[PDB]
């Protein structure tokens, strides 16, 4: 029927209060700084390397992505801040690679482009990490991969951190062999010079495109056969497009230049015989009833000052409609049912510390969502897990483990958004990075550590006073200042959003307006895989 009226969330804030104005100014400053940093990352390796890249007749890699995807279609780029201030004097913009979810020939694909302007396409350790994260996104969501290979091989003085381990360079080819065994298409466009580790990327792909007189594939290049076997060969007749396309048979399609390679790639994606079938129910999409710079006014940048998570849900969901679940029992967790772009979402949001009743409310909700096949969105703003004595007497760590066990075992698409702090085992109760969410974005005011600075300094000082009390002497003000300096400094440095996305601990720092769009994009990509039945473990009652 769906004609009967309901109520909506959200209230209009006081635009003149000094709290709102200060919060708006702080979050506007953070978002402007985020914008200028990513505009510097957008250039890549500087204008010298871009000039020498277009002097050989190639496109720049973002031009390749713009010409590959559908015209006017959005592009969800993942981990734009990988490698940011990570290596000591080396600048690696974007990680040295560009990964994203786009729309090619009406199919949502994962696109992995070697940005060859930075370090000649060398593979730093964060490059391997960011590429492996893109590949596990594409295997989880069942998205075809398009690799735009312009590589340079594995860096040498970091070779340990690139070569042998489980989640090191060789995993890449493992992920190609397994995805193609599940009918997840791999397409490689060779636009560069694949030297001996990159050379396995087109040879492990179902269909190749290589560019005339520009793309080269060899298991051992000219200086490599020089140092290994002692031989001089020219590169374009050692591994050029003519040899591979006509004699050896490594390549399947042959392109004149980069525009022809991208046109052929769109043809290849169209001949994949793929049709997206949905299993959730869809309703007409509707925009909310409130703007999204109000989120700048509401959230701010002060993590010591709490707010209400219902104001955020009011500004990201369809029509600001929200069916709340158990609204009075355990009210530091907000659970409910909403819709984003017509998709049904179960939302779990933090509003305080986690008590025992909040964790039981969350476990009931996650079982409900897995029984009905409804995707989950976690909105992390955590400070703790209620330390105390009357709390451990009840079973608080008996109740947060049920929350952890239900979030781990859940087989629906889960997406996390960290809108505030995220500390301790609370981070595990609300689907942190270890619990395999499909995506995990953060806002520019977030913090993530094990216990925040003050607490770690206090615990270390009190345990070393206890420890030294086998003999026992104090250095009171000296120990205080000399432990409260380098621990607060370290925890505030490593809790930053740029510190955590300089690694690949999340999928991006996003602007609080763009939030709604980004969730919709992620949720539609996450619906390419059919939702499987959930089996839970043993709930410890």
């Amino acid at each position: 029927y769906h004609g009967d009226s309901v109520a909506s969330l959200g209230t209009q804030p006081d635009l003149g209060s000094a709290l709102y104005q200060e919060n708006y100014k702080q979050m506007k400053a953070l978002v402007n700084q985020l914008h200028e940093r990513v505009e510097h990352i957008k250039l890549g390796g500087g204008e010298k390397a871009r000039a020498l890249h277009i002097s050989r007749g190639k496109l720049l890699p973002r031009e390749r992505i713009d010409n590959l995807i559908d015209p006017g279609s959005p592009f969800l780029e993942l981990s734009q801040f990988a490698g940011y201030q990570l290596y000591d004097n080396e600048e690696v913009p974007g990680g040295g690679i560009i990964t994203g979810i786009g729309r090619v020939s009406g199919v949502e694909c994962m696109i992995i482009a070697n940005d060859a302007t930075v370090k000649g396409g060398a593979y730093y350790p964060v490059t391997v990490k960011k590429q492996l994260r893109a590949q596990e996104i594409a295997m989880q969501n069942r998205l075809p991969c398009i690799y735009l290979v312009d590589s340079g091989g594995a860096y040498l003085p970091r070779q340990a951190d690139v070569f042998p381990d489980r989640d090191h360079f060789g995993r890449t080819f493992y992920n190609q062999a397994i995805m193609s065994s599940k009918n997840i298409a791999q397409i490689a466009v060779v636009m560069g010079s694949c030297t001996a580790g990159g050379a396995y990327v087109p040879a492990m792909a179902d269909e190749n495109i290589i560019v005339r007189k520009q793309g080269t594939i060899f298991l051992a290049g000219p200086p490599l056969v020089k140092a290994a076997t002692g031989e001089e060969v020219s590169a374009e007749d050692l591994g050029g497009a003519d040899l591979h396309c006509r004699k050896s048979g490594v390549s399947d399609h042959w392109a004149l230049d980069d525009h022809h390679a991208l046109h052929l790639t769109r043809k290849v994606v169209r001949n994949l015989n793929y049709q997206k079938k949905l299993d959730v129910t869809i309703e007409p999409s509707e925009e909310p009833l409130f703007p999204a710079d109000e989120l700048y006014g509401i959230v701010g940048a002060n993590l010591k000052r709490s707010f209400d998570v219902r104001e955020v849900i009011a500004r990201i969901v369809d029509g600001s409609r929200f069916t709340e679940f158990k609204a009075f029992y355990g009210d530091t967790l907000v659970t409910g049912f909403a819709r984003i772009f017509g998709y049904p979402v179960g939302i779990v949001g933090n509003n305080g510390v986690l008590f025992s009743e909040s964790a039981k409310k969350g476990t009931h909700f996650v079982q409900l969502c897995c029984q009905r096949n409804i995707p989950l969105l976690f909105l992390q703003n955590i400070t703790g897990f209620m330390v105390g004595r009357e709390y451990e007497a009840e079973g608080i760590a008996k109740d947060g483990a049920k929350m952890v066990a239900a979030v781990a075992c859940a087989q629906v698409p889960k997406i996390t958004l960290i809108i505030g702090g995220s500390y301790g085992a609370g981070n595990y109760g609300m689907c942190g990075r270890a619990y395999s969410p499909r995506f995990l974005y953060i806002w520019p005011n977030a913090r993530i550590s094990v216990m925040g600075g003050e607490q770690a300094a206090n615990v270390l000082a009190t345990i070393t006073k206890d420890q030294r009390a086998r003999e026992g002497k104090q250095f009171s003000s000296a120990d205080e200042a000399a432990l409260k300096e380098p621990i607060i400094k370290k925890f505030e440095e490593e809790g930053n959003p740029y510190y955590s996305s300089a690694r690949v601990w999340d999928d991006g720092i996003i602007d609080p307006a763009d939030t709604r769009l980004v969730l919709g994009l992620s949720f539609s990509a996450a619906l390419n895989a059919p939702i499987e039945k959930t089996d839970f473990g043993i709930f410890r009652m």
Binding site: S73, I510, D511, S524
Partner: protein, 210 residues
């Protein structure tokens, strides 16, 4: 004689093309199962950055590059040579004709939009302008060796002969068929390497020219 298009007219041609591509996107979506979904809106919304599309339109004989920035509010900022235009608009239908509704720097206009193969037609009350879309090379592009180990049937040429391209040079029968060697080359046959009746071998030279 034909007159050059104004930069505002190139903005209208670029906008009509972009909106036509959107129309194709919309009619694909209407046939999709995944309806109402994002990606269907041709908004060009990149994350944290803007998207600029570089297209080239051919005005008569000369090419003009137009850099189209997709704005968050649905407008376009089109920079043609150096000058930036604020370009907004949409399509609407009246009967069986499609019209392009434009607003360029606050100046509203209306023209009929017809796109036939490569040519963009804009019919207005001040004239008619034809802008062409360039065609990329890969859509407009369309000595000898013995193929199999077979016996030679007939040799057509001698040492010292002058032939043309697409001319019968040697014939060989291989197993079940008949494959004539013909010349792509130019020049003079100095050498008939195989006598008549001999057995040539795959990927081998039959005739050499100096």
């Amino acid at each position: 004689s034909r007159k050059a298009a104004a930069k505002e007219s190139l903005c209208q041609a670029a906008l009509g093309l972009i909106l036509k591509e959107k129309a194709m996107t919309d009619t694909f979506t209407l046939q999709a199962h995944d309806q109402f979904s994002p990606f269907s809106s041709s908004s060009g919304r990149r994350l944290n950055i803007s998207y600029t599309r570089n297209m080239t339109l051919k005005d008569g004989k000369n090419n003009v590059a137009i850099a189209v920035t997709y704005n968050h509010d649905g407008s376009y900022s089109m920079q043609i040579e150096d000058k930036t235009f604020q370009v907004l608009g949409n399509l609407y239908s009246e009967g069986d004709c499609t019209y392009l509704k434009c607003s360029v720097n606050g100046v509203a206009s209306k023209a009929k939009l017809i796109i036939l193969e490569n040519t963009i037609y804009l019919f207005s009350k001040e004239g008619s302008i034809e802008i062409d879309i360039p065609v990329p090379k890969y859509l407009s592009s369309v000595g000898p060796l013995a193929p199999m180990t077979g016996t030679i049937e007939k040799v057509f040429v001698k040492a010292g002969d002058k032939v043309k391209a697409g001319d019968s040079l040697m014939v060989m029968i291989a197993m079940k068929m008949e494959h004539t060697i013909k010349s792509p080359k130019d020049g003079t046959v100095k050498k008939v390497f195989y006598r008549e009746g001999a057995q040539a071998n795959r990927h081998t030279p039959l005739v050499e020219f100096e």
